[PDB]
Amino acid sequence: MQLNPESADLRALAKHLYDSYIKSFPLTKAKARAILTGKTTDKSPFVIYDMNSLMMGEDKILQEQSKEVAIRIFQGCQFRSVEAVQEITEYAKSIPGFVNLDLNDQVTLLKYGVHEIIYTMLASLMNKDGVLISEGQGFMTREFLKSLRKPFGDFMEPKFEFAVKFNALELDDSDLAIFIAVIILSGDRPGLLNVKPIEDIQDNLLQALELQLKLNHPESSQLFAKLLQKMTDLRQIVMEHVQLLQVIKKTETDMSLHPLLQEIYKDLY
Amino acid sequence: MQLNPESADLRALAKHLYDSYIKSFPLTKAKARAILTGKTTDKSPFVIYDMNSLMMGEDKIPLQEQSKEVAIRIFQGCQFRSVEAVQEITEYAKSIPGFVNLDLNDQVTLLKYGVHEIIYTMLASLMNKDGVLISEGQGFMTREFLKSLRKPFGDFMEPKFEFAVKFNALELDDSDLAIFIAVIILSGDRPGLLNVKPIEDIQDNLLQALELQLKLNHPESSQLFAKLLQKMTDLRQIVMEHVQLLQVIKKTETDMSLHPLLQEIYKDLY
């Protein structure tokens, strides 16, 4: 490793991705950690730890029902998911060379990868106790999400399980900006014609990420390998999610989905 | 990259894994590629490209519907080998430095989730754009023939062929495969394990060994380490779509049994 024009360019590529990551995503890992440790005073979130804390929290964010509780939560998860797909698309277009690829392959790269990004970025909002909700305005506890009516008391546990392992790597927004870009640009997704120009964009991004982690994480040896193996855990989560979603469409027929999400989930896994 | 005691040890770890890989697996990539390119002069396999080539081929290896009878036998022969393969992988796993000293419940666990990932990584060595070597180089079944089989069997081999194409383009050899296989086995993030600390401790070395092997052996391929690691993603997807498909053949066909060794592996998996 040395200071040469190629290394200087890999840093330039890294800065670019970071600046566009900041421009695309409003709730950054730095921003969310600050809240999660109480370093901010403006963003003091309400904690939803039970039913009585949820009903009071709905005032900020029939006679009696617990079914309406699991329905309302799940709908709000897909409410944010749609807003998130918009940001990821805005971001994807800023990756050097993405636009100049086949548009039918741009559609493809975003179709399979959007969910992997969603969950990578969701871990930034999480801790062993719970998740930040409503752009940092609320905090829903892990155990509360777990107590929800079957089979909803299981749709968030794999994300929390992942989040714990991922967060132990101690990555920052500068590292996440390259990693997110790496995930998008993959030459092993189905329905791709031009894998050659994609694998060349990713080769640069991987070269950029390897250097970023070398400079930023002197302590973590084999982090590059560790971070790359998390893409395996992300695919499993995306797969177990669509597998769980088929149970919602079947067992509880009266549970609709947004047409933007309906197109993504169609003919996926 | 430098020559120091740690690097010398990583090479020793690499040699060890290769020598046990050779001892465990009889049909190596080198061996299979020679058959596939007609460089061997004895192992001349019979090509099964349709129905008539299969019947004549069955002479070399039920009044029911022909298309159903043929799909059933093929699918059974895929699992007959799969069993023989699990035995080889287990023999290999025991040779990885530190595997035996771990928890035996964790040893059972690691092999439970990883055996299928290895099976498919090693299956790609027997494959080319045209088909797959069957019965240890005695036969060659075509991709398109496997694709024509009665629903939903005409779909169980396509993901393996798709993978194989991408994996083989990396141009790995038995030395590289020997470390990669070992890396897959020592996966930390699997269910039913509490001793993640010693498991990760083994994989960190294996990964360090693989990074050096690819650096020395593949001077041309600059991000081969990153590329090869991303294939573990494709392997998990295949193992997942496989168990998901296996569910269909039991619900569709009541008269479709499985070997008790495989029955234990697939149980409570994905």
Author numbering:
A (entry chain B): 230 to 290, 298 to 505
B (entry chain A): 230 to 290, 297 to 505
Paper text:
PPARγ (peroxisome proliferator-activated receptor gamma) is a transcription factor of the nuclear receptor family that functions predominantly as a heterodimer with RXRα. PPARγ is a key regulator of glucose homeostasis and adipogenesis. The recruitment of coactivators by PPARγ is primarily determined by the interaction of coactivator LXXLL motifs with the receptor LBD. Helix 12 is key regulatory structural element in the activation function 2 interacting with coregulators.
The PPARγ T475M LBD mutant was crystallized in its apo form and in complex with GW1929 and the PGC1α coactivator peptide. In both functional states, PPARγ T475M crystallized as a homodimer. PPARγ T475M, localized at the dimer interface, exhibits an increase by 2-fold of the binding affinity to RXRα compared to PPARγ WT, as a consequence of a slower dissociation rate of the dimer. Interestingly, the most frequent mutation, T475M, induced a slightly higher increase in the ligand-independent transcriptional function of PPARγ as compare to any of the recurrent mutations considered. Comparison of PPARγ T475M/PGC1α to PPARγ WT/PGC1α RFUs revealed that different regions of the T475M mutant presented a significant lower deuterium uptake, including H2, H2′, N-terminal H3, H6, N-terminal H8, helix H10, and the H12 helix. These regions are thus more protected from deuterium exchange for PPARγ T475M compared to PPARγ WT, which might be in favor of a decreased conformational flexibility of PPARγ T475M compared to PPARγ WT, in agreement with MD simulation data. Thus, our structural analysis of PPARγ T475M indicates that the mutation stabilizes PPARγ helix 12 in the active conformation as well as the heterodimer with RXRα, leading to a stronger binding to coactivators.
